[PDB]
């Protein structure tokens, strides 16, 4: 749909269960492990999947592809191995907490830690 001038959207639910299904294939093929028994190329696994999302120009068709990956942390620690690979690849995060979910705020988006680095250049003039 990007190659033929159309628009698209994709949702990976979720990317933290692909790094686990790939670690099992590595350690059964006897590859050298690394941090948390992940191989040396788990950064190269997620980078060449998210870099395929692009905004093409008018000489090629004007298509697009938008990518929303889901990542599950454990006890809110984003400083793990896979929660730091996919954070440094993408643009901004939406950080849903569990404390605000029971205090009444639903959807529980924390806007203190959520950013977007395309900024205000994707909003309409009214909004």
């Amino acid at each position: 749909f990007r190659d033929n001038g159309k628009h698209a959207l994709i949702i990976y639910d979720d990317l933290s269960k692909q790094a686990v299904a790939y670690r099992q294939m590595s350690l059964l093929l006897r590859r050298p492990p690394g941090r948390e028994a992940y191989p040396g190329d788990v950064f190269y696994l997620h980078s060449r999947l998210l870099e395929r999302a692009a905004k093409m120009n008018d000489a090629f068709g004007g298509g697009s592809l938008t990518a929303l990956p889901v990542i599950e942390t454990q006890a809110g620690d984003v400083s793990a191995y896979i929660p730091t690979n996919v954070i440094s690849i993408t643009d901004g995060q939406i950080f849903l907490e569990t404390e605000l979910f029971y205090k009444g705020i639903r959807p529980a988006i924390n806007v203190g830690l959520s950013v977007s680095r395309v900024g205000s250049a994707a909003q309409t003039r009214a909004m």
Partner: protein, 78 residues
């Protein structure tokens, strides 16, 4: 640390989960205060008037039985 998404940040309800000095000073202050409120709410709960009447009678019945005993004692002696 906390002035980024990466670093450690504290949530709500972290003094009791630690279980230290302030975590024990908080549990014995919620109990020594709500012990006196089980006194004032229970002492004023005895001020139901219908219970006092019922108790005006149980006592009466008890006393009437004692009188009955005495009356029988007299009957015998006579």
């Amino acid at each position: 640390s906390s002035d980024t998404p990466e670093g450690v940040r504290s949530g709500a309800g972290a003094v009791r989960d630690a279980g230290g000095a302030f975590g024990k000073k908080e549990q014995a202050d919620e109990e020594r205060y709500f012990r006196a409120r089980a006194r004032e709410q229970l002492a004023a709960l005895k001020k139901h008037h219908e219970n006092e009447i019922s108790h005006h009678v149980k006592e009466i019945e008890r006393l009437q039985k004692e009188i009955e005993r005495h009356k029988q004692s007299i009957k015998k002696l006579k």
